[PDB]
Ligand binder design. Structure first.
Ligand SMILES: Nc1ncnc2c1ncn2[C@@H]1O[C@H](COP(=O)(O)OP(=O)(O)NP(=O)(O)O)[C@@H](O)[C@H]1O
Ligand SMILES: Nc1ncnc2c1ncn2[C@@H]1O[C@H](COP(=O)(O)OP(=O)(O)NP(=O)(O)O)[C@@H](O)[C@H]1O
Ligand SMILES: O=C(Nc1nccs1)[C@@H](c1ccccc1)N1Cc2ccccc2C1=O
Ligand SMILES: [Mg+2]
Ligand SMILES: [Mg+2]
Lengths: 300, 302
């Protein structure tokens, strides 16, 4: 039973859209402003407007999901904050000024250190492991669905509710979605990071992806990945869903790797790239990230 | 140590003036982290008088203390920039100071908000006392609104870093510039008075030079129309000539907490029934958007 107090019902008068941030299969994301009743302040939020207008009875099913998505509580998962049931439904969550991780790593190619990359792999695995523990399946994990709270803190979004090149073969062939097909997409998500945001299977029609996968072909080793990192990615893309790693294991493996980061990723000038000092880390949190969180795995 | 960030002029920029006081000017600002493209809103206080390189060592010693203050009801210094001026960086509070907030919501604030504000301010002041720090400039203008449910004392120590708030000051502070936790308690009483009157000016139109003589005559700020006698009694006890005869912040937490539990027994406010602490729903929203900080549960009515 989801605590429905966690899902605020918004009135259309309480908020305004002010900028488009992007779009995807299900809707259009806006940066918006929430103006609390009787106050003078404008509070930035992110708003997703769904693609299709809905009936009151369809709105019921949307509301049931919304109650569930408002109920998650983990430092590496975003929760839904509110909902507006206009003709076409609008959804409100926290605005991330750093955007999604996909855009972040593209803007910082190739000037992201190994420490950051491997730590993001841990945080995304923790977030996913939590979803598994709540018995939620993501169905759409990708770098565009990992949000950057601060560069040291990423959070999974848009879970629980096609992107062929992120999908496990059984999902492509049978529309089966499990925690283990989420693990496949984890693999692709890790590939996106390690390539600083390249497009998976670029140039290949979605049409042919299932065929290519059956031939045993896969995304290529990114040039910064040592063979153990690559091996992990390949294990995520095994035909047999049960042979793939569990998110629990992925937390452990990547945490180990984060302890000796230059041993597992090879990045030119890695020595010189920023590893966040305590001073910088504390500033970011005091400024824009006060939530309770874990400690980041640092190099021994 | 690692609590005070030293910034360079290149990574921040002042935008708009928010206000000025005795020691400097406050700006709505932007923090532009090196190599990032995001602009993070901050507040910047530039002190009035330029700095020596030797007066820099003084400022930093104190800044490091201000950055060490970790409590949900006190603001900490986040960063500093030392040029010809001294610039101090802290979290921007969009809601502004408590003084402004009570004026703007004048007569539309419930007893539960007012009494809980008194609890929170008392907790934050008690924390400074436990750390052996004196504020020296407590007033409603130096309490900030994080959300309407969450207020935080600001600008402590800044008075030690360097026009005189006579009408907030204890008598021994006026006459001898003695500042103690017990002189902070005097100012706390004044602060509470500011809130209970929805932001009236204390001793309005009475010359500052006359204040010490007024106080010596046993005269004090008047009972706000919404305060019952027990609440006015606490305030009057904060303004006792004998400092050790004033309440301790510790006690003030206990008293106002007691009162927040039965708020209509202690404040008489017209329309108070249609004003209430936020639903959990509404409180959840506010916290997710504005206040991820941990903080004690707000005292609710029995
Ligand atoms: N809370 C948010 N804060 C800041 N930016 C966001 C937020 N949510 C989404 N965005 C950005 O808006 C874009 C569109 O989001 P979305 O509508 O969910 O499509 P997508 O996830 O990128 N692709 P799809 O998998 O088809 O849904 C995202 O890629 C982000 O760049
Ligand atoms: N972090 C902050 N966020 C938003 N507004 C602030 C902040 N700090 C101060 N202000 C406002 O900036 C203005 C100036 O504050 P300040 O320079 O400290 O003088 P003052 O507190 O009003 N009087 P005093 O400090 O006692 O001399 C006031 O309007 C404050 O409400
Ligand atoms: O709202 C979400 N994304 C946003 N991006 C910007 C503003 S909102 C997303 C989400 C899922 C899980 C956690 C947080 C958000 N939802 C919720 C939800 C409830 C009912 C029906 C569809 C959706 C949906 O897509
Ligand atoms: Mg998305
Ligand atoms: Mg001030």
């Amino acid at each position: 039973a989801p605590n429905q107090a966690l899902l605020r019902i918004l009135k259309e008068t309480e908020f305004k859209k002010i900028k488009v941030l992007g779009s995807g299969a299900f809707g259009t994301v806006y940066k918006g402003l929430w103006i609390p009743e009787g106050e003078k302040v404008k509070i930035p939020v992110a708003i997703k407007e769904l693609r299709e207008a809905t009936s009151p009875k369809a709105n019921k099913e949307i509301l049931d999901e919304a109650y569930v998505m408002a109920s998650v509580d983990n430092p590496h998962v975003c929760r839904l904050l509110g909902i507006c049931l206009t003709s076409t439904v609008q959804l409100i969550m926290q605005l991330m000024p750093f955007g999604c991780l996909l855009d972040y790593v593209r803007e910082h190619k190739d000037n992201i250190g190994s420490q950051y990359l491997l730590n993001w792999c841990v945080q995304i695995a923790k977030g996913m492991n939590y979803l598994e523990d709540r018995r939620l399946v993501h169905r759409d994990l990708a770098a565009r669905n990992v949000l950057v709270k601060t560069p040291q803190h990423v959070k999974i979004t848009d879970f629980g509710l096609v992107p062929i090149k992120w999908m496990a073969l059984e999902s492509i062939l049978h529309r089966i979605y499990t925690h283990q097909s989420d693990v496949w997409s984890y693999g692709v998500t890790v590939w996106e990071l390690m390539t600083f945001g390249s497009k998976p299977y670029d140039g290949i029609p979605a049409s042919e992806i299932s065929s290519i996968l059956e031939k045993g072909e896969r995304l290529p080793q990114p040039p910064i990945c040592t063979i153990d990192v690559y091996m992990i990615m390949r294990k995520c893309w095994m035909i047999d869903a049960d042979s793939r790693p569990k998110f629990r294991e992925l937390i452990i493996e990547f945490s180990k790797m984060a302890r000796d980061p230059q041993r597992y990723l090879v990045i030119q000038g890695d020595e010189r790239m920023h590893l966040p000092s305590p001073t910088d880390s504390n500033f970011y949190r005091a400024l824009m990230d006060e939530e309770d969180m874990d400690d980041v795995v640092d190099a021994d």
